[PDB]
Design a protein around this ligand. Structure first.
Ligand SMILES: O=P(O)(O)OC[C@@H]1O[C@H](COP(=O)(O)O)[C@@H](O)[C@@H]1O
Ligand SMILES: O=P(O)(O)OC[C@@H]1O[C@H](COP(=O)(O)O)[C@@H](O)[C@@H]1O
Ligand SMILES: O=P(O)(O)OC[C@@H]1O[C@H](COP(=O)(O)O)[C@@H](O)[C@@H]1O
Ligand SMILES: O=P(O)(O)OC[C@@H]1O[C@H](COP(=O)(O)O)[C@@H](O)[C@@H]1O
Ligand SMILES: [Mn+2]
Ligand SMILES: [Mn+2]
Ligand SMILES: [Mn+2]
Ligand SMILES: [Mn+2]
Ligand SMILES: [Mn+2]
Ligand SMILES: [Mn+2]
Ligand SMILES: [Mn+2]
Ligand SMILES: [Mn+2]
Lengths: 312, 314, 314, 312
């Protein structure tokens, strides 16, 4: 296409409006390079762990960005503090590559990231990453399925870019995404049926055997958080990974899995609650803490939230 | 890196269908399916930047004809099974669903091109009867999955071999020989939105997987909601996949001819059963090319743990 | 865009070598040359980010063997013509230069894989004698060029067809049917560094192109210095390409077997002459697989404007 | 590769040292996108003028860069003045796609560009592009052959990046390039033999029939200025497109063909003269004016330059 709106033409053009320095653009342009390379690695990761190439790749692209200063990765015990020569104003938490076990079965997998601004004056530290999700300035994920997709939610909107492999560019395809109010799909690992709390297990029922002699909801669960969330965003519906007895605090880690999706979700007009509070309003105490997550089309998540304090 | 001895699926079917002296007709039919499968992957990868199943149907048909190895073709997307013109004829009957999941592209879920192949068992002029053979008479079946990679799985009489597209040289390269499914699994895949309409045999089974009586751990639910995807996760990780019938789709949803059957063949050559619930899917005599069938496939000790339950109900 | 009726060279040679009833053996040999040609293009494109001709030699040989359509193979890079093992034999003799220009990669000049093919004309056990046939007995010759595109040119008995690699679906797609060279040209291509050692026939000709006596405009000099490149610019734009002999390379530089001959065949099927200077390159009886020959190819009215001059000197 | 040095990681990292604004990086990152897309267009421009897609593409990427303000293209009668909303400090002259007729014969073709800094205070104008080549701050070319190559010469050096099609990134492969002093190749269209001036036609002789009973030079002429120049830079030698009677002012246009190559050449230690003066020292009077060009390994160009005033 001639006037190809790249992700970069787009992030640089909205960045100009903050009367800024250019680091968001640098950040994202460098992140994009980790994403292409991981997409390429996964499109032939069967012709002859991966997590780590993907990981070392993302730290690398992001140090060199000259836009980072704290980096919180799924894979490292401690946060990574960017060397001074190369420090900048942003904080990025990220899961580099999600559902890596699911690549043997050819499950659509992805990289999820959340960017914060270091607002305080002292030496960069974990504390700076201990901000509530509400506070994020940018988030999204890159999906690796039939096509490689980058959904990017910033203050102005949630947008979708698809990588065009012919030119090695991410191109803008869906603009200012909004989720459907109510929709026909619930998504949850029904294998934990004996584990679930009553609120959920009533709701499941209400969708299979709908009291108003209606059409039941369909069941979906790819088992790769990014595929299910991206489905919930484009087609509407709900996704749940509620706490259960195998995992009372939730499974999906907060800083790099829940809070990005949550942000992307609310920015399109969905909700994401733990059933007891907004995901984005949680103040993290540990950079590796988990959360319950119910996200999706408002009326449904709501239908659930009422069932929560219809059972309170 | 850069490898002088690549196994393209052309070379590998040529070492099945040539030591067997069969003229390697098969090979040019399979080669041709690869050109089609490859173009559907490209188009899909750039999907959202450029119906797709009509055009993939037209594609598959055109390449198929030109293999000079077909006489009848059945599509999901076509009424009358296409009797190949004479000039280009050959002995095989190919059955196919060119773009399985056409809906699911929008949500970026893996989808695929399934295919079944027969050999015409008659001395005559082709007709869709030449196609109405059961699975036990399939010479080869397979499918190509458009996932985070484009993997072709091809099962002939020896067993199943996966092949994966190396997008750089554009050849399906061999990555797994003589595949055998896990014997028992830990995943049941089924659309529980239909909970209500399930026949009791199925329903007792879902509760036996969720709430094991013999105090093990509950099976993990999965369900991409794309047949290609759920079969393949079943083939490699084991697991049971069930699309039984309900009343809404009273004799099930999946067409026998080019869905339940090519899968069920791939399945059984890998040590996996495949049944309707009463009889095996590979022995039903097929009467309408678009005749539907229930199908339960996957690891033998689960298909069986469910057939007992089905037997225990009639 | 996205086209349901693609002409892959597999489909096109199958409509030359099948209406002719010849078993389409040829086709699996050509198919196999495409896997090799494709991997050499990828490796070359990423060249400077990862000998290449040894590995392309090993590649071509391996794919070749596995077509089950060869019995003798000659390489530029090998001494003894490779007599294919029995299990995998077939009737063709293939002659090749797997990576012509191995030197020139460094300077990013287009280079290519040339090939000549024969049919074994004997009732025996293969030997490099089965290879020592002249060009008039070539069943098909071609070359693939690794340029700004990867174009395969294939000339069989009907004429020449160019094919170009569509890197997305990874298939050589047909782009020019039954090619015919320009009759007269305006380009002479030759390494004038060798000015001094040129035989007088050649020298009078270079002055006739630079300084036309019959007051036209001077021919444009060209010369990539890669045989594949200069032949192809000659094939399409016309022009005369000359690597005559000098004393330094006293019976010329280009090996007959798999350089002068496959080119000269491609050339003549496109209405272009090809000679050593005395005799046509396609009728020399080949005695050593590495036997060299001068070659002048290109548009007929120029080859001729030079053969007159050669005749006028002896 | 994990720590993949992209062209952008490289231009941003040396740009930081000018204590700058970030426009060189923006400029080049946007130019790179026109180059990938033209490379892709040419690698299948036979499966079914081009100049113009290539052209409109480059203007577009470069307006949107927010780094341009005057653009001088081979293809436009007048310079292009970047709209204010989008103007920046740089001036780019470029031939978008060179030797377009040569794509039918599969000749290695390319895009050549030269970047200037607008130093004056008034409305951007042609005059700003009327600077001597000496003055350039950045130049190079992108080659489209077996591989797509981007040679980029800035104040610190001439460097070579090759596009890795697997990731859509230009990666750095040759560092701080230097040409060989003397070498074995002359390159010139010998078809103009009756046209050439004595200086040249003596030199040609001296190389074919070398007076010191030496090895003669080899002849090369791909007929696509970028392939011949890139050969002359990597392997050493000389390239000439001298003035002749069909073209007394030279053929190769100055602002966008001669002066970039010339700059790249001198930065690697070669020379480029018109036989009567340095190419880079010419002060252009018209943005479309041509030059004689002799560039290459010093001793040879010199051997020629002496023959020039051995004949003066
Ligand atoms: O290893 P990751 O990156 O944490 O990815 C696995 C995640 O963990 C979940 C697995 O939970 P289940 O037990 O419900 O399968 C998946 O849905 C998510 O993708
Ligand atoms: O429309 P297709 O190409 O037949 O593919 C969709 C199929 O139809 C099923 C959908 O059934 P549900 O009603 O359970 O979603 C999928 O599982 C299968 O892939
Ligand atoms: O080394 P190769 O693979 O034989 O290729 C080089 C060939 O050798 C010739 C070089 O001859 P010059 O001495 O005239 O350069 C080229 O024109 C041909 O392509
Ligand atoms: O059309 P462009 O971009 O100007 O490219 C053609 C150029 O013009 C020269 C042609 O000159 P000759 O007359 O010597 O072929 C080529 O060498 C150069 O690439
Ligand atoms: Mn992960
Ligand atoms: Mn994770
Ligand atoms: Mn379908
Ligand atoms: Mn179907
Ligand atoms: Mn060679
Ligand atoms: Mn050679
Ligand atoms: Mn041009
Ligand atoms: Mn030009």
């Amino acid at each position: 296409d001639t006037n190809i709106v790249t992700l970069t033409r787009f992030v640089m053009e909205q960045g100009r409006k903050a009367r800024g320095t250019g680091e968001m653009t640098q950040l994202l342009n460098s992140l994009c390079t980790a994403v292409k390379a991981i997409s390429t690695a996964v499109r032939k990761a069967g012709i002859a762990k991966l997590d780590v190439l993907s990981n070392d790749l993302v730290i690398n692209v992001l140090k060199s960005s000259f836009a980072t200063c704290v980096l919180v990765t799924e894979e490292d015990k401690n946060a990574i503090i960017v060397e001074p020569e190369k420090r900048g104003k942003y904080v990025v938490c990220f899961d580099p590559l999600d559902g890596s076990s699911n690549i043997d079965c050819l499950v659509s997998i992805g990289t999820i990231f959340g960017i914060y601004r270091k607002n305080s004056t002292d030496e960069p530290s974990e504390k700076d990453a201990l901000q509530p999700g509400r506070n994020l300035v940018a988030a999204g994920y890159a999906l690796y399925g039939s096509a490689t997709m980058l959904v990017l939610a910033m203050v102005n909107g949630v947008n979708c870019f698809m990588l065009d492999p012919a030119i090695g560019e991410f191109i803008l395809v869906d603009r200012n995404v909004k989720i459907k109010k109510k929709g026909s799909i619930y998504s949850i690992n029904e294998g934990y049926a004996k584990e679930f709390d009553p609120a959920i297990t009533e709701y499941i029922q209400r969708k299979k055997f709908p009291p108003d002699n209606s059409a039941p909801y369909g069941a979906r669960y790819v088992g790769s958080m990014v595929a299910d969330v991206h489905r919930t965003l484009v087609y509407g519906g709900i996704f749940m990974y509620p706490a259960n007895k195998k995992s009372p605090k939730g499974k999906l880690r907060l800083l790099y899995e829940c809070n990005p999706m949550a942000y992307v979700m609310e920015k399109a007009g969905g909700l994401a609650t733990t059933g007891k509070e907004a995901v984005l309003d949680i103040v993290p105490t540990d950079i590796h803490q988990r959360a319950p997550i119910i996200l999706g089309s408002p009326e449904d998540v709501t239908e659930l939230l009422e069932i929560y304090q219809k059972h309170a």
